[PDB]
Each structure stands twice: as structure tokens, then as C-alpha cells.
């Protein structure tokens, strides 16, 4: 064939730390459908937000939103134990239609999006050239936000020990422990990937006996 | 990959 | 917009050395229209072929052919001084027109493509992937075809200026310049630079006595 | 870029 109808931009939904993930790739053809597995990003987390977005920007915020819905009623549970599934498909008149599922309460909610949404052809184009001359540091947004994560992660693990080893901890082992805690907190809030994992280190560092 | 948490 | 009907892989025609040279880029939305102007590869050529492509290989053979046509009626000239220019004309049916025209005879051809030709959508996800598994691969290619095209350029020049140069050229010299010019023949088949090149060098070590004949 | 000629016999 000669022609086709294609999705002209990524398309995908916002992630934790403000990243845009991809699930269906620019310039796919029409129709299409692909599904992938989310979790959620702390403990406990009832609800989740599905932001979805058009474009080629690794920071969520660059690139188009289409719209958004929440879904609730999902079991409190440790951070990654839920499985929501979100489903992408395109129908052949260009219609979007995204929905999540979470896998243990089968609660599911969906959004229907119609073919005219999101960037015409002229913001398409300066889409695709703003992504590759925005790729070095789009890049880096990425590994930065990929730290952060860890990161945050690593300050509540690390909190979580404190509270259940308490008393058997030592009271200078604690200590330092909270003080490699405060610096860590706040080299999160900066965009130095390297101070980050710096301060991760030193945490680790005082850490040996609460592990 | 995470939901952004709440 | 979340749909836009557009030519899914690269358009273009097929040039000296096996080279697929693009008119319309993949994914152009239509309908669409792009010229160039191409010209001879060799001295006095009176004919060019229009081998029409789709694909998104450098060489010209690992990509679909479409169709075919030739411009005849090219008058005598220099390599590369003809003016031949090629059109690709989609239009919103998704048929393809490509045109050739050389600028000093006014002489035109034309064919038209229908909107199902060419490869299917398996075969286009599977191009895509080719030609990225195989980018540095066709770097190198087009490397390598730069260097034939000033081969076979060297040889056909030489072979030129022996047939001229007929009888006021030595018989020493003659068959000296038949063994080389064969052995640039050999060399030009295959893929290494450096060989082509030095079988052109071996072709000038011999060729004085026919440069002053020839100038 | 350059063309090539038709196809000789």
C-alpha cells in the first residue's frame, strides 16, 4: 500500500515523578491496541490517576493531555503489589479508548476520546524536532526521575526500619541514621542525579546495623 | 512502571 | 488530531550504484508532492531509467520495487550536465504519478502507480525494523558506492580515450591499460574501498602516454 | 544524483 492511517505521536500516560510513558509508539498504524501492567507508586495508595498524553517529551508536562480519570477502591497494599492494566485502542475512525483495570478488585474505569483531540499537523512537526533537540536532557529528566524514585523509595524503607528494629537499635545508630535521612530529603528536591545517590551511599553507610 | 502516588 | 492518513515508508528512485535516493520521506502525510532534479551517470548517456522505490534501505535492491520507466532522447553531453527532473505527485487516492523531465530536449515520461501497490502492513513494520538493524551497515554502503561511482567513471573515461587515441597509442601501452582497466572491473564488484582505489591508482601508473595523446 | 540507462540486451 501506498498510504496508511497512522497515530502521528506517542501516545501514553503520566508516571510517577512526572515522566510520560509510552504505550502506543508514534507513527503506529491504525488500528491498534496494547496493553500494559502499572503499580502503585507507595504504600497503601487507594486511588490512581490516569493522565493521558500525546507527544514525544520524556517530562510528562511537554506534551499534550487528552484527559484524565481516576480509579479508587483499590485494597491498601504495599507499593507494586496492585496490578492495573491499562488498556490503548485505536479504533479505525481514530477514536481513542483508554481504560484501567485493577486486577485484584476488578474495579475498572475508562475514557472515550475522539479522533480530532490533541496537536495538529503543524504542532506535530515542531513535537518531533522539539523532542530531538530536547533529547540529551530529555534523557536525563528520565535517569534523574528514575533516582528520585529509587530514592524516595529508599527514605521510607529505610523509615519503616527505624520504627520496627526501634529499641534494638542503637541510639547512635539512629541518629545518624535520621541525619542521612534529612540530607537525602533534601538532595531529592535538586536535579543532581550524582548528589543524589551521593547521599543514598552515605546512608547506606550508617546503616549496617539497622540491616 | 508507578501511578503517580497521591 | 490522533489519525493522519500518511505515505507509511520512503519513496524515490534508484541512482548510479545501486543507491535508493528519496523523494518522499516516510510518514509525509498526503496528499504530497516533492521534485528533484537527477542527471546522467556517464558521458553522452541518451537514456535514464526511472526504477521507482519504496523503503527505507540505502541500497536499492532491499527495498520494493513499484515500477519502471525510460527517458529517451537525452542529447550528447558531459556526465552530470543533463537536467532531468523527477516528480512524485501523491494524491488524496493514495495514487502515486512520477514524471521525468529533461529541461533541453523538453522529452517527458510518466507513469502512474495505483494506491495498493507496494509492501503490505507486515512487510512495512518489518522494513522499519531492517533499516534500523541495518543503519550502520548502509552508512558504510554509501561510503563504498561513492568510490565505485568514480571507478566506473575512471574506466569508462579510459576506455573512451584508448578508442580515440586508436593507433597513435602504443601497443606497450595499450595492452598495459587493457590489463588494468579489467582488474578495476574485478575490484568494482566488491565492497572494499581500498582495493577500488588502489586498482584506479595501478589504471593512472599506465596511462600517461594517453593522457598527453587525450590532452 | 546520478541515473543509470535502461537495461542493454
Same mark, same amino acid.
Given at each position: 500500500?501506498?498510504?496508511?492511517?497512522? !497515530?502521528?505521536?506517542?501516545?501514553?500516560?503520566? *508516571? %510517577?515523578?512526572?515522566?510520560? !510513558? =509510552?504505550?502506543?509508539?508514534? #507513527?503506529? =498504524?491504525?488500528? !491498534?491496541?496494547?496493553?500494559?501492567?502499572?503499580? =502503585? &507508586?507507595?504504600?497503601?495508595? $487507594?486511588?490512581? *490517576?490516569?493522565?493521558?498524553?500525546?507527544?514525544?517529551?520524556?517530562?510528562?508536562?511537554?506534551?499534550?493531555?487528552?484527559? +484524565? /480519570?481516576?480509579?479508587?477502591?483499590?485494597?491498601?497494599?504495599?507499593?507494586?503489589?496492585?496490578?492495573? @492494566?491499562? *488498556? /490503548?485502542?485505536?479504533?479505525?475512525?481514530?477514536?481513542?479508548?483508554? $481504560?484501567?483495570?485493577?486486577?485484584? $478488585?476488578?474495579? @475498572?474505569?475508562?475514557? !472515550?476520546?475522539?479522533?480530532?483531540?490533541?496537536?495538529?499537523?503543524?504542532?506535530?512537526?515542531? %513535537?518531533?524536532?522539539? &523532542?530531538?533537540? #530536547?533529547?540529551?536532557?530529555?534523557?536525563? /529528566?528520565? @535517569?534523574?526521575? +528514575?533516582?528520585? #524514585? +529509587?530514592?524516595?523509595?529508599?527514605?521510607? $524503607?529505610?523509615?519503616? +526500619?527505624?520504627?520496627?528494629?526501634?529499641?534494638?537499635?542503637?541510639?547512635?545508630?539512629? *541518629?545518624?541514621?535520621?541525619? &542521612?535521612? =534529612?540530607?537525602?530529603?533534601?538532595?531529592?528536591?535538586?536535579?543532581?542525579?550524582?548528589?543524589?545517590? &551521593?547521599? %543514598?551511599? @552515605?546512608?547506606?553507610?550508617?546503616?549496617?546495623?539497622?540491616? | 512502571?508507578?501511578?503517580?502516588?497521591?
Amino acid at each position: 500500500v501506498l498510504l496508511l492511517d497512522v !497515530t502521528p505521536l506517542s501516545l501514553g500516560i503520566e *508516571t %510517577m515523578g512526572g515522566v510520560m !510513558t =509510552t504505550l502506543i509508539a508514534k #507513527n503506529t =498504524t491504525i488500528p !491498534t491496541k496494547h496493553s500494559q501492567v502499572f503499580s =502503585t &507508586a507507595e504504600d497503601n495508595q $487507594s486511588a490512581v *490517576t490516569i493522565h493521558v498524553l500525546q507527544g514525544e517529551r520524556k517530562r510528562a508536562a511537554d506534551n499534550k493531555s487528552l484527559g +484524565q /480519570f481516576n480509579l479508587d477502591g483499590i485494597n491498601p497494599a504495599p507499593r507494586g503489589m496492585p496490578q492495573i @492494566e491499562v *488498556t /490503548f485502542d485505536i479504533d479505525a475512525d481514530g477514536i481513542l479508548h483508554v $481504560s484501567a483495570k485493577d486486577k485484584n $478488585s476488578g474495579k @475498572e474505569q475508562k475514557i !472515550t476520546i475522539k479522533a480530532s483531540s490533541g496537536l495538529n499537523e503543524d504542532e506535530i512537526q515542531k %513535537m518531533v524536532r522539539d &523532542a530531538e533537540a #530536547n533529547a540529551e536532557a530529555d534523557r536525563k /529528566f528520565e @535517569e534523574l526521575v +528514575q533516582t528520585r #524514585n +529509587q530514592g524516595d523509595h529508599l527514605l521510607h $524503607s529505610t523509615r519503616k +526500619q527505624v520504627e520496627e528494629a526501634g529499641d534494638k537499635l542503637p541510639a547512635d545508630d539512629k *541518629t545518624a541514621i535520621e541525619s &542521612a535521612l =534529612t540530607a537525602l530529603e533534601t538532595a531529592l528536591k535538586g536535579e543532581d542525579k550524582a548528589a543524589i545517590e &551521593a547521599k %543514598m551511599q @552515605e546512608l547506606a553507610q550508617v546503616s549496617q546495623k539497622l540491616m | 512502571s508507578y501511578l503517580p502516588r497521591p
